[PDB]
Design a protein around this ligand. Structure first.
Ligand code: GDM
Length: 215
């Protein structure tokens, strides 16, 4: 018998609103979700990279600085793994939903006024939530040098959970799994995703591997 403690958290009110907005509104061009996944991976990779300049020991958990992108049609998932800095449990609790952040209300206001469109979400520091343009459920596995591996999960609806992660160890970094909406499964088509990764990684300084799963 396996045993696991799972903690449930409620999204901050504005974050809940933003998630409903991203989910319950039709947006015709959703490819920003991929730009954001890759940009966030790159940011996390930058952070560990710069940390390694002043402290070489930070890389001992995983030497490679790389991104892996894994479309899996059978599983209806898109997975993006980085070997960046990773996030502690508290990092994920604080930054993946409980704490109100500086750009949330401003983004929502600009969405409604037309000052911003959905593709500009990243500028407001809430680009993670763009995953809900294409996914019903998002799972974030993360491993920071200062903590054990944890797994965050949400299907929106106002709550997330976080638990000690007993799945494949990352060494260091973050593995985000998007459980794709039935209407957005075309994002798992091999050629489509390969080419979109090319399109949205033009300024990325880290190796990317595209691993297409066949079952
Ligand atoms: C400048 O940093 C960014 C912030 C500030 C803050 C959260 C940074 C975070 O603090 C713990 C780490 O320093 C950073 C390395 C981790 C990531 C980028 C994670 O990505 C991966 N692959 O690790 C991302 O994972 C889903 C987590 C939150 C992202 C959010 C909520 C977002 O919507 N936009 C943001 C994008 C950013 O670039 C954002 O708010």
């Amino acid at each position: 018998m396996a045993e696991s403690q799972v903690e449930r958290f409620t999204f901050q009110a504005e974050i809940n609103q933003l998630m409903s907005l991203i989910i319950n509104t039709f947006y015709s061009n959703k490819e920003v979700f991929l730009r954001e996944l890759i940009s966030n991976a790159s940011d996390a990779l930058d952070k560990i990279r710069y940390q390694s300049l002043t402290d070489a020991s930070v890389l001992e958990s995983k030497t490679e600085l790389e991104i892996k992108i894994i479309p899996d049609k059978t599983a209806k998932t898109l997975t993006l793994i980085d070997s960046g800095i990773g996030m502690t449990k508290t990092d994920m609790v604080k930054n993946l939903g409980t704490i109100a952040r500086s750009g949330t209300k401003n983004f929502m206001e600009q969405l409604q006024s037309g000052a911003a469109d959905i593709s500009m979400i990243g500028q407001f520091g809430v680009g993670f939530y763009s995953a809900y343009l294409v996914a019903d459920t998002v799972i974030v596995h993360s491993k920071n040098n200062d903590d054990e591996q944890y797994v965050w999960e949400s299907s929106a609806g106002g709550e997330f959970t976080i638990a000690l992660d007993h799945t494949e160890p990352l060494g260091r970094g973050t593995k985000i799994v998007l459980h794709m909406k039935e209407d957005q499964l075309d994002y798992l088509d091999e050629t489509k995703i390969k080419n979109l990764v090319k399109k949205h990684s033009e300024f990325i300084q880290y190796p990317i591997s595209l691993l297409t799963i066949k079952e």
